[PDB]
Enzyme design. Structure first.
Site, mmCIF file in Angstrom:
data_model
loop_
_atom_site.group_PDB
_atom_site.id
_atom_site.type_symbol
_atom_site.label_atom_id
_atom_site.label_comp_id
_atom_site.label_asym_id
_atom_site.label_seq_id
_atom_site.Cartn_x
_atom_site.Cartn_y
_atom_site.Cartn_z
ATOM 1 N N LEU A 3 -71.707 45.359 -32.504
ATOM 2 C CA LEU A 3 -71.546 44.419 -33.609
ATOM 3 C C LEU A 3 -72.885 44.043 -34.245
ATOM 4 O O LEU A 3 -73.543 44.879 -34.864
ATOM 5 C CB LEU A 3 -70.799 43.161 -33.153
ATOM 6 C CG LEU A 3 -69.343 43.337 -32.711
ATOM 7 C CD1 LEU A 3 -68.774 42.024 -32.196
ATOM 8 C CD2 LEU A 3 -68.491 43.878 -33.847
ATOM 9 N N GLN A 17 -75.982 43.415 -33.270
ATOM 10 C CA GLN A 17 -77.171 44.182 -32.905
ATOM 11 C C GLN A 17 -78.468 43.421 -33.177
ATOM 12 O O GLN A 17 -79.000 43.450 -34.286
ATOM 13 C CB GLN A 17 -77.181 45.538 -33.619
ATOM 14 C CG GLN A 17 -78.331 46.446 -33.227
ATOM 15 C CD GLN A 17 -78.288 47.775 -33.954
ATOM 16 O OE1 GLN A 17 -77.553 47.940 -34.927
ATOM 17 N NE2 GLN A 17 -79.074 48.735 -33.481
ATOM 18 N N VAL A 57 -74.857 42.585 -29.246
ATOM 19 C CA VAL A 57 -73.486 42.085 -29.174
ATOM 20 C C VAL A 57 -72.458 43.170 -29.505
ATOM 21 O O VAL A 57 -72.566 43.852 -30.522
ATOM 22 C CB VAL A 57 -73.273 40.854 -30.083
ATOM 23 C CG1 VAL A 57 -73.757 39.593 -29.390
ATOM 24 C CG2 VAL A 57 -73.984 41.038 -31.406
ATOM 25 N N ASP A 98 -82.724 27.537 -36.707
ATOM 26 C CA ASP A 98 -82.541 28.241 -37.968
ATOM 27 C C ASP A 98 -81.073 28.569 -38.237
ATOM 28 O O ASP A 98 -80.412 29.223 -37.429
ATOM 29 C CB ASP A 98 -83.383 29.518 -37.985
ATOM 30 C CG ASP A 98 -83.116 30.411 -36.785
ATOM 31 O OD1 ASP A 98 -82.698 29.884 -35.732
ATOM 32 O OD2 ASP A 98 -83.325 31.638 -36.891
HETATM 33 C C1 SU6 Z 1 -66.501 41.237 -36.787
HETATM 34 C C2 SU6 Z 1 -67.881 40.930 -36.317
HETATM 35 N N1 SU6 Z 1 -68.202 40.137 -35.288
HETATM 36 C C3 SU6 Z 1 -69.529 40.076 -35.149
HETATM 37 C C4 SU6 Z 1 -70.343 39.328 -34.131
HETATM 38 C C5 SU6 Z 1 -69.728 38.223 -33.315
HETATM 39 C C6 SU6 Z 1 -68.395 37.882 -33.040
HETATM 40 O O1 SU6 Z 1 -67.250 38.491 -33.485
HETATM 41 N N2 SU6 Z 1 -68.375 36.812 -32.241
HETATM 42 C C7 SU6 Z 1 -69.640 36.422 -31.957
HETATM 43 C C8 SU6 Z 1 -70.145 35.371 -31.174
HETATM 44 C C9 SU6 Z 1 -71.512 35.190 -31.046
HETATM 45 C C10 SU6 Z 1 -72.387 36.051 -31.699
HETATM 46 C C11 SU6 Z 1 -71.890 37.091 -32.476
HETATM 47 C C12 SU6 Z 1 -70.506 37.277 -32.604
HETATM 48 C C13 SU6 Z 1 -70.091 40.884 -36.133
HETATM 49 C C14 SU6 Z 1 -71.544 41.121 -36.352
HETATM 50 C C15 SU6 Z 1 -69.047 41.430 -36.883
HETATM 51 C C16 SU6 Z 1 -69.155 42.357 -38.053
HETATM 52 C C17 SU6 Z 1 -69.672 41.873 -39.371
HETATM 53 C C18 SU6 Z 1 -69.648 42.846 -40.506
HETATM 54 O O2 SU6 Z 1 -68.970 43.906 -40.403
HETATM 55 O O3 SU6 Z 1 -70.303 42.612 -41.560
#
Ligand code: SU6
Ligand code: SU6
Lengths: 646, 646
Positions: free
Chosen positions: A16, A18, A24, A136
């Site tokens: 995710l 990164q 993540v 931040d």
């Molecule tokens: C669907 C999803 N989840 C995340 C990251 C998290 C998530 O789900 N819980 C979290 C809890 C704590 C930190 C990151 C996350 C990302 C970067 C994306 C993709 C974002 C994208 O495609 O632009």
């Protein structure tokens, strides 16, 4: 190829966010199959005792709030034994993800922005009232989840990881001045941490509101750090945006929101002050938290009453505090529409609206923005209309460049999107205008009918007076044949002199009524011949073209991610680029030559009908007052004195 | 499970240094099978153009030097496409690896330290004369390779990666004062980069020389940053080490090397000044590079002449500049041994050494430290002997703690190692002492024989004089029977008065010679009855015990890496711990009660024999001068005048 724990598992492909200090991934609980975001602490991390990690575990589980991502567990990778953090999965992505949609290229929709404000300040509050202050805050670390009711909830993440693995084990080999740099670092927790977050927060709010950063050099903040640094600190108070439009040019200065921002006039008026002193870099004029919270809470607690000025042809969102009076309401409607309380005339669902000095906003008529409170003055003012930025299509570089093509497609999609939004809003203004106009003529007809009721009511009085004096004079000129004809003839003559005026009004009224009939003069048929209609389906035409453009954009995006294409793939890419050009140009030509044109025709006619109607209204009021005058003048003749007898 | 490129491949298990911004693995070239260290740029990195990477590629391939790790290629991971750096594999590890050996617990062997100096300053020079100045130099990033001749070559790494991925994409959301922190950062390339590296370099040199860091709080530099920061900056010039021995105690101050440091007196004397002003934090008194290079080069170019003081019982490494005279040599030997040039008496391979005002050090007798230039005074001074630190075994915690046990084992192994080194050196001092003593008595015998040659040479002169005057007096008392017996009787009486003195010396000499015979008085048999011998094999006994201890140490290390043990494994661990106690205690009891004791007995006897020998020498010189006196006094009687005749 997958990593695992005791209760969780995830593919390396399911990555995710990164980050640098960690990564993540999208993973699952191996027993339930539920989805969780796991955070593997890369390949350094653990040499820290279990006591600290369990006290932080414990203090982080107390964080049970709507605007903070839940932390389900702390666990250990199976065949690598470096820490993993089990947290809540947010499938919708982050605020950054939302902002990267071309539909939000020029700022979020207003309700969504309010949601963002509420959420971010909520998570900030819940964070500050406990341990950890969020250093931040950016769109990147503000996750979005869709609640059970369909509307989003935003959650703060990344705050516990306040790990200091940077510096430049070069600790015990450093020159004293790197340690003095460390001194220059540790002077931040003093106060520049309980007011330093507010900067990033304010910049975030501006980003979500306008669809752009507050402080941008010639071709990017990061792509040129010097003039960026020079414009950030060199900014005076009250200024919320500094933009370097030219290459080595100066700066454009604004304490207001960009014209492209479609946030309501009221919300904006309540938002620019908070952005002003949250974007300061010195002392107690930077508010501090508690006042920022109190103020933002004040803004967020307000209910909105939709009002529409039929005179300026402008829509309005009035941010009233629900518990406050109708007086301050009229003062708000004044503050936006520049028409003072006494002048204001309200309409709601075909009929007048009348409210008093202290009718609180709770029991106010529930208003949407398709059925608002129409408002009009009595003081002949010009139409203003919709205030939008006139954004043109960027040039589509005659070339081949997957990255540049992706960016270009994003730009074009955003612009065409803004066009669709603008066209839709214009159609709405014309519709509210038509309906409001129809209600206004019906209402003027009401006033007319009431006036006629009055006039006839006094006409029967005049009639009975005159024929009664004639009755008496007759039954006396025959009985006691003798003569004082002077007095009775005088007052009779007076009553007749009144009857003449009555006739005048009786004809002038038939005139005024004739020009409210279909026939013409003040018919609303212009609203049927001028402007654009829902039946024209221009919004959905623009929407079809926008869909094509968006299709091409997503395709160009995946092409960019492909790094380079095959032969046929490349040719198809170019074909689609020119197709995108045609779609966009067609769409904007339709916007200009079909939407804006007819819209402005409509608006012009609306002015050149508003003048007529206001004139007729002045007349009708004039002769209504005439009717009252006559009434009270005739009331002086019901019990006239007689001579004393013997 | 492995990663790959076009020409290289590596297992994830074959990890090496393991950094934050990247990782380094042991990999192979897929065509040749050769070994290379590969550097995968973790999971961020690449968004930078190929132009910059190729110009940096190009500028980094110009780096072809002995003290810089070679960069063979830049390549790309197959199924991940994030950059990998193909560099030279260094199987021996780094300087940190070398320093972590308990044999180097109290500083590197001298030759190895010289190698480290040469190497590090070489890589620094080659780095500075081209692009890039090495910001921070530590044992961690100084790799070790074994050259074709067996002796090591040290190579600098980690310098191109000057990437600034830290700060705290939070760049465009930061408060102006983080940018002011960035200002406080960019003020380093001004000059605090061409003199800021020298600090880390100096600390490194001290680390490799002493086996310890220059600036250490109560229980660790990192484990307490405050008083560390307070002792680093608060240090005055000339001071090279500040140590907080107590918990909240003050600081011990030293501008000299620890007693534990076994680096030669001369090298140390040339090293402490360079460490002094390389460890300064203000202005041009911090030397700067060019002077540091010139000085270190001066030190490194020198050749060493081994000399051994038989009077103080001390070994000496004289650092002479090869092209410089024997005068400055005598001034150096003076500077260490406090005996002035004129007093100095040299011996080499059983015979005297005599050299002049300007015999350059190139043609000097080649000296090792088992066959050096023995040196002695004529001015009766005390013995000094070996100067070592008296390090005792740390307490072996009656407990169970794999990490603590590993550390304890390391400490004990280091201490016992220092013990073996010290014992070996003591045996060497006793051996050089014995051999030097034997040569000295043989040499005194030489001087004696020469003296006797002289004395007899003058005795035949006296004899011929006397019997000739008797001859003449006789052949005249019979021929011309007549008489001047006064004159001839006077001079005859004089010659006899000389003969008496001759007899005195002739007996006194037989006395002096009698006490150089085996018999006794000044026999060297004490050197055969006192002290320790190679035949005692104490060094190898200490070495056996040290081997056991080291075995247990490595086992405890792997036990520590096991995190926790099985049952039998644990019991074995404890058994081995107490075994380690017994081995160590036994070893040190043998060191004290067998090595140091007999050594000091030997040393004492050596003093109480040096006095005797010097006394006898004074006597022998006295009567040699007597013999010269007699010779020149008799030379006045070979052509005595006679009376004038007719
Ligand atoms: C669907 C999803 N989840 C995340 C990251 C998290 C998530 O789900 N819980 C979290 C809890 C704590 C930190 C990151 C996350 C990302 C970067 C994306 C993709 C974002 C994208 O495609 O632009
Ligand atoms: C044998 C070896 N190589 C390395 C790392 C490198 C190597 O070979 N070339 C390199 C070139 C550039 C950077 C690192 C290396 C390490 C950390 C170790 C292990 C050290 C140890 O066990 O203490």
């Amino acid at each position: 190829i997958c990593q695992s724990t005791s209760n969780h598992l995830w593919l390396l492909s399911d990555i995710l966010g990164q980050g640098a200090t960690a990564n993540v991934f999208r993973g699952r609980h191996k027993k339930t199959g539920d989805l969780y975001a796991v955070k593997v602490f890369n390949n350094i991390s653990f040499l820290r005792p279990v006591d600290v990690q369990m006290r932080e575990f414990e203090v982080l589980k107390k964080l049970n709030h709507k605007n903070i991502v839940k932390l389900f567990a702390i666990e250990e990778e199976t065949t690598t034994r470096h820490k993993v953090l089990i947290m809540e999965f947010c499938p919708c992505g982050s605020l950054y993800t939302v902002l990267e949609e071309p539909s939000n290229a020029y700022g979020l929709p207003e309700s969504e922005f309010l949601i963002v404000l509420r959420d971010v300040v909520g998570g900030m509050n819940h964070l500050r009232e406990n341990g950890i202050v969020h250093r931040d805050i950016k769109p990147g670390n503000i996750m979005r989840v869709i609640g059970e009711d369909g509307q989003s909830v935003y959650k703060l993440t990344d705050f516990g990881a306040a790990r200091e693995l940077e510096d430049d084990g070069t600790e015990e080999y450093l020159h004293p001045d790197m340690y003095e740099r460390a001194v220059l670092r540790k002077d931040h927790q003093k106060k520049y941490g309980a007011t330093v977050d507010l900067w990033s927060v304010g910049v975030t709010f501006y980003h979500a509101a306008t669809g752009s950063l507050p402080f941008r050099p010639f071709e990017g903040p990061r792509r040129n750090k010097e003039v960026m640094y020079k414009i950030i600190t060199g900014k005076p108070s009250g200024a919320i945006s500094g933009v370097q439009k030219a290459e080595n040019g100066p700066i454009d200065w604004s304490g207001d929101m960009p014209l492209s921002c479609s946030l309501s006039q009221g919300l904006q008026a309540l938002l620019t002050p908070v952005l002003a002193n949250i974007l300061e870099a010195d002392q107690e004029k930077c508010w501090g938290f508690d006042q920022f919270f109190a103020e933002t809470s004040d803004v967020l607690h307000r209910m909105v009453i939709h009002v529409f000025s039929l005179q300026h042809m402008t829509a309005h969102k009035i941010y009233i505090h629900s518990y406050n009076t109708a007086a301050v309401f009229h003062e708000l409607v004044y503050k936006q529409t520049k028409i003072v309380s006494s002048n204001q005339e309200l309409i709601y669902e075909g009929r007048r609206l009348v409210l008093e000095l202290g009718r609180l906003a709770q029991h106010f008529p529930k208003t949407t923005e398709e059925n608002p409170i129409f408002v009009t003055s009595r003081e002949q003012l010009n139409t203003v209309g919709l205030r939008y930025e006139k954004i043109s299509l960027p040039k589509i570089h005659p070339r081949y460049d997957l990255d540049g093509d992706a960016s270009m497609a994003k730009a074009v999609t955003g612009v065409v999107c803004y066009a669709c939004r603008t066209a839709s809003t214009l159609l709405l203004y014309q519709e509210l205008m038509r309906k409001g106009v129809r209600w206004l003529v019906e209402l003027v007809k009401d006033d007319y009918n009431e006036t006629v009721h009055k006039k006839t009511e006094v006409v029967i009085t005049l009639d009975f007076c005159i024929r009664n004096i004639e009755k008496t004079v007759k039954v006396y000129e025959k009985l006691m044949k003798v003569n004082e004809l002077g007095e009775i003839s005088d007052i009779h003559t007076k009553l007749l002199r009144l009857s003449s005026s009555q006739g005048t009004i009786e004809s002038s009224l038939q005139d005024i009524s004739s020009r409210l009939s279909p026939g013409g003069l003040l018919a609303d048929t212009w609203a049927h011949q001028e402007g654009t209609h829902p039946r024209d389906r221009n919004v959905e035409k623009l929407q079809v073209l926008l869909n094509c453009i968006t299709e091409i954009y997503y395709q160009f995006k995946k092409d960019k991610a492909e790094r380079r294409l095959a032969y046929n793939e490349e040719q198809i890419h170019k074909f689609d680029k020119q197709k995108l050009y045609y779609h966009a140009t067609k769409a904007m030509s339709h916007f200009s030559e079909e939407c804006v044109r007819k819209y402005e025709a409509f608006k012009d006619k609306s002015e050149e009908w508003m003048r007529k109607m206001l004139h007729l209204r002045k007349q009708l009021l004039s002769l209504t007052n005439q009717c009252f005058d006559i009434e009270e003048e005739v009331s002086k003749y019901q019990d006239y004195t007689n001579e004393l007898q013997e």
